[PDB]
Amino acid sequence: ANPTVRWRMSTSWPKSLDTIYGSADELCKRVGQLTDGKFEIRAFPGGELVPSAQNMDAVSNGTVECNHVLSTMYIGKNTALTFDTGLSFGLNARQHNAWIHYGGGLQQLRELYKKYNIVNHVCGNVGVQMGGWYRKEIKSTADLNGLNMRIGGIGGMVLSKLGVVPQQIPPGDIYPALEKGTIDAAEWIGPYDDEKLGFNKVAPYYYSPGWFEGSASITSMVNDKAWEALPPAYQAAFEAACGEQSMRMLANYDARNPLALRKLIAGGAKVSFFPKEVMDAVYKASQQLWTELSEKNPDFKAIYPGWKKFQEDEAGWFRVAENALDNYTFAAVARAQAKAENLY
Amino acid sequence: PTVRWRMSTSWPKSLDTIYGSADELCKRVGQLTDGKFEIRAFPGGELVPSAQNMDAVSNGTVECNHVLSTMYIGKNTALTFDTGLSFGLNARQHNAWIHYGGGLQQLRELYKKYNIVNHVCGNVGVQMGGWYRKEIKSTADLNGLNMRIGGIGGMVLSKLGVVPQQIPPGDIYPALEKGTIDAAEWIGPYDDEKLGFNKVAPYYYSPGWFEGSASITSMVNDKAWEALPPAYQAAFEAACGEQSMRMLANYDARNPLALRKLIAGGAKVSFFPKEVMDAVYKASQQLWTELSEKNPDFKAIYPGWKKFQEDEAGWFRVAENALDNYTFAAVARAQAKAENLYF
Ligand SMILES: O=C(O)c1ccccn1
Ligand SMILES: O=C(O)c1ccccn1
Ligand SMILES: [Ca+2]
Ligand SMILES: [Ca+2]
């Protein structure tokens, strides 16, 4: 019989986010079901076992067996981690999971993570994020200069090029900073989570889109010795649960975000698109950053050329069919809705 | 406990995308149970004709299948909510509806009538529009067309004078070669190239509006399901949930190279005219009204499903589609600029 195994999972999230934290809980729950309770993983909210800033190191050290994180919180350690979470203007969620599981990505990331005593698993995605919450209007790239912005992931490094001062403030600590004015702006994820955390109460302007990542993919880093110690059925249980949550976390966001955005607008949130001039500047800054990271970090250089070719192939294909139909359907659905609303 | 199941799929083994996903599913269930829960997948037609795969599960001939549920619209057209409606939800939205929008529970009530416990276990995304001998310049070119097409889109196209046939995948090419059909859609570049349609039809149209996404189902005999211990049920559910991501991830990875190969070999890739798109969209909407009036099981699901699509499309237009449209265009522009070509 397979042994009884007890793990701790240190997440980076508050329990109140029944989207991203809820998915960590589901993951743990499913592993229990699969192993008849013998493989017991207990999830902990951000900051409870260690500060979320320490969640990668805590796994590498064996302090906890695994975590549930945004890997590019740890770009200070290695910027190549951005291939795991997502690059600015990068792959969308579909394309990212394609790259990871059938495009050779997982193997390249496993090699990277091995250096830090980690076996990595993709275990979620939150899709395209919003552009965040701003106290003052963003009219041009000039408005970014000197901006104190809470932002997670590689997009902070991009925005730095345009004068933004970024901070990866943990989610539960964003609101007081925004309320006090020690930051001017904050992005987190999207309508459902953002409404829960309360940012609309203290910033009137909500921009789109969150170009910061093509999709923000979520990772469970596992300690290599903890992983190797598992029997094959338990390794499979963890893999399968992660694969399943790679669909379910985003399914929950997709299900919950629309009503949340409706509520936000009804409550007074002013929602609009970033100006084209801003989009073009942050796109240009992104591309410059990849050149710089390739030249500075051999681990980034090793992955980028193949990743870029994969994005070129994926974007080209999605323009042919996937996005051709979605563009048509979304517009037709909107027209039909407008027609019904105006039928009186 | 050693449990041995047969899974009757609808697909040729050569499709290492959709059939390979069925194999992966079975393989994962084995891993999760240390070999104890053994499911063996069989290609289309091997145990029963794929046209019989739903009935073979209902009457317990096999424990489960791996199918396009709208192959069986002749039995109940409300099955289209499982697979997908024409101009329906995209894959993400469909999985959202199923798992967090109440879709799965509504489908379970429908399927119980047929002694089935259903699980979503894959998706092939937005399909291509198919293979044609003659250009499609207007809806007039659809009138009288003999077309191989799977799923509810065949019913939509019937309204424009198409005669649809749900010919099994391994039998499409000979019909197209011989000329007993004028046109055929299957799925997309990787599978279509594998099956060989480009050898006998010059025109490849886009997009396959037939489903917003073609979702794949494993129908499980309800007595076979009920007998399983909880860990084995969880193994099957998790394997299905994982393949709901992995099958489409494999198609996404493979399709771009296959399309390049197809074009390099002479396939002419074209978009349906706006006039055709508008016509099939209109016919789709007319069909849902008719199916709602004729089939109480369809009427029961449609209003809530429609509201869910409205909510989803409204939200995706704000951020998801805004960034995808910007990025896909930027990637193309950068490609052109690298070759000193105009974009
Ligand atoms: O820290 C962030 O900004 C973050 C975390 C998880 C998902 C998306 N974004
Ligand atoms: O029969 C079909 O046309 C079919 C089957 C599976 C997936 C997509 N399409
Ligand atoms: Ca974020
Ligand atoms: Ca099809």
CATH number at residue B180: 3.40.190.10
* Strand B64-66 with B3-9, pairing: parallel
- Return the CATH number at A244: 3.40.190.170
Rounded to a whole number of angstroms, the distance from the CA of B84 to the nearest CA of chain A is: 13
**Encoding tokens for residue B48?**
């029963």
Query: What are the backbone angles phi and psi of residue A119, rounded to the nearest 5°?
Result: -110, 115
- List the structure tokens of A23: 């998915």
Which has the closest alpha carbon to A76: A297, A303, A308, A305?
A297
Calculate how far, in angstroms, residue A212's C-alpha sits from the geometric centre of ligand 4: 35
A276 and A136 in one domain? yes
- Walk across the sheet containing A5-11 and list its strands: A39-44, A5-11, A66-68, A217-223, A118-125
Question: How many CB atoms are located within 10 Å of the residue A1 CB?
Answer: 7
Ligand 1 atom, smallest distance to A129 CA: 8
Three-state secondary-structure class, residue B310: helix
Cα Dmax for chain A = 68
Chain B residues in contact with A334 by the CB 8 A cut-off are: 313-314, 317
A268 Rama class: left (phi>0) / alpha (psi -120 to 50) / beta: left
Dihedral of the CA atoms A56, A60, A62, A66 (nearest 10)?
50
Helices A276-296 & B320-338 angle (0-180, nearest 10): 60
Phi-psi region of B286 (alpha: psi -120 to 50; beta: other; left: phi over 0): alpha
Please name the residues in contact with A162: beta carbons below 8 A apart, sequence gap of 6 or more.
A141, A144, A145, A281, A282, A285
Contact indicator for B78, B295 with CB cutoff of 8 Å = yes
Angle at A123 between CA A121 and CA A128, to 5 degrees: 125
Residue A115 amino acid letter = K
Cα A111 to averaged position of ligand 3 atoms, centre (Å): 26
B126 CA from centroid of ligand 4 (Å): 9
Q: Are B216 and B289 in a shared domain?
A: no
CB contact under 8 A, B327 and A316: no
Q: Measured in angstroms, how far is the CA atom of residue B15 from the centroid of ligand 4? A: 14
B230 touches chain A (CB under 8 A): yes
Residues B238, A316: C-beta atoms closer than 8 Å: no
Residues B133 and B278 placed together within one structural domain of the fold: yes
- Sign for the CA dihedral angle at B320, B321, B324, B326 comes to negative
What tokens does B53 get? 């795969």
Distance CA B292, CA B188 (A): 30
Give how far A50 is from chain B: nearest CA, Å. Answer: 30
- Our answer on whether the CB atom of B214 is closer than 6 Å to any ligand 2 atom is yes
d(C-alpha A335, C-alpha A341), whole Å: 10
Strand order in the sheet with A132-134: A165-167, A148-150, A185-186, A132-134, A205-208, A270-273
- DSSP state for residue B127 in the 8-state scheme: B
Q: Is the dihedral angle over the CA atoms A132, A138, A139, A144 positive or is it negative?
A: negative
C-alpha B31/C-alpha A33 separation (Å) is: 14
Q: Which amino acid is at A9?
A: M
Residue A113 lies in a domain: yes
Same domain for B16 and B113, yes or no, is yes
Please, is A151 exposed, middle or buried when counting C-beta atoms within 10 Å of its C-beta (0-12, 13-18, 19+)? buried
Closest-CA distance of chain B to residue A93, Å:
9
In terms of domains, do B196 and B172 share one? Answer: yes
Give whole-number Cα distances, A64 to A57, A81, A113, A220, B95, in Å. Answer: 9, 20, 16, 12, 32
Radius of gyration of chain A from its Cα atoms, rounded to whole angstroms: 20
Q: Per the domain annotation, does A341 fall within a domain?
A: no
Structural domain tally of chain A?
Answer: 2
Residue B16 Cα distances to B95, B237, B270, angstroms: 23, 22, 27
The 8-class DSSP code of residue A275 comes to: P
B36-39 contacts: CB < 8 A, separation 24 or more?
Answer: B36/B1, B36/B2, B36/B3, B37/B3, B37/B5, B37/B228, B37/B232, B37/B235, B37/B236, B38/B2, B38/B3, B38/B4, B38/B5, B39/B4, B39/B5, B39/B6, B39/B7, B39/B63, B39/B64
B176 is in which domain, residue-wise? 124-209+267-294
Main-chain phi, psi angles of A68, to 5 degrees: -150, 100
Q: Are residues B182 and B107 in the same domain?
A: no
| Residue A6 CB-density burial (10 A; 0-12 exposed, 13-18 middle, 19+ buried) | exposed
Q: Specify the long-range contacts of residues A39-42, CB closer than 8 Å, at least 24 apart.
A: A39/A2, A39/A4, A39/A5, A39/A7, A39/A230, A39/A234, A39/A237, A39/A238, A40/A4, A40/A5, A40/A6, A40/A7, A41/A6, A41/A7, A41/A8, A41/A9, A41/A65, A41/A66, A42/A6, A42/A7, A42/A8, A42/A9
Residue to substitute in B121, B187, B190, B195 for testing ligand 2 pocket (most ligand atoms within 8 angstroms of CB): B187
Q: Are B268 and B203 in contact (CB under 8 A)?
A: yes
Residues A121 and A2 in one domain: yes
Residues 6+ apart with CB under 8 A from A163: A144, A145, A146, A147
In terms of domains, do B169 and B304 share one? no
Tokens matching residue A107: 């193997």
Query: What angle in degrees, to the nearest 10, is found between the helix axes of B230-264 and A232-266?
Result: 80
Q: Look at residue B338 and tell me if it is in a domain.
A: no
A75 close to A84: Cβ distance less than 8 angstroms: no
Are residues A80 and A18 located together in one domain of the fold?
Answer: yes
DSSP structural state of residue B195? H
Resolution in A: 1.6
> Residue B260: how many CB atoms within 10 A of its CB?
14
Closest C-alpha among B106, B84, B218 to residue B156: B84
Q: Which two tokens stand for residue A129?
A: 């994020």
Q: Which of B34, B90, B253 sits opposite A326 (nearest CB)?
A: B90
Question: Is residue A161 domain-resident?
Answer: yes
Burial class (CB in 10 A: 0-12, 13-18, 19+), A336: middle
Q: Taking Cα atoms as reference points, which of B197, B186, B220 lies closest to residue B112?
A: B220
Q: Which ligand is nearest to the CA of B53?
A: 2
**Portion 29-48 of A in contact with B at CB < 8 A:** 30, 33-36
**Residues A246 and A307 reside in one and the same domain:** yes
Is the four-CA dihedral A222, A228, A229, A235 of positive or negative sign? positive
From A326, which residue of chain B is nearest by alpha-carbon distance?
B90
Report chain B's C-alpha Rg in angstroms.
20
Residue A308 within any structural domain of the chain? yes
Position B343 in a domain:
no
Size of interface A-B (CB pairs under 8 A): 248
Euclidean distance between CA atoms B205 and B192, whole angstroms: 12
Residue B339 lies in a domain: no
| A39 falls within a domain | yes
Give the C-alpha separation, A166 to A186, whole Å: 9
Residue whose CA is at the smallest distance from ligand 2 atom 1:
B150
Give the helix ranges, DSSP H, for chain B. Answer: 18-32, 53-58, 80-83, 91-100, 103-112, 153-158, 169-178, 189-195, 222-226, 230-264, 274-294, 296-318, 320-338
Report the separation in Å between the CA atom of A287 and the middle of ligand 4, taken as the mean of its atom positions. 38
Nearest to A53 by CA among A207, A143, A171, A204: A171
**If you write DSSP's letter for every residue of B29-72 in order, what string do you get?**
HHHHTTTSEEEEEE-TTTSS-GGGHHHHHHTTSSSEEEB-GGGG
Report d(CA B184, CA B237) in Å as an integer.
Answer: 33
Place of tokens 């870029």: A308
Whether B221 and B202 share a structural domain? no
Let me know whether A151 and A108 are in one domain: no
Q: In a 3-state reduction of DSSP, which class is residue A69?
A: strand
CB contact under 8 A, A333 and B309: yes
Q: How far is CA B282 from CA A89, A203, B184, B223, B278, in A?
A: 35, 43, 22, 42, 6
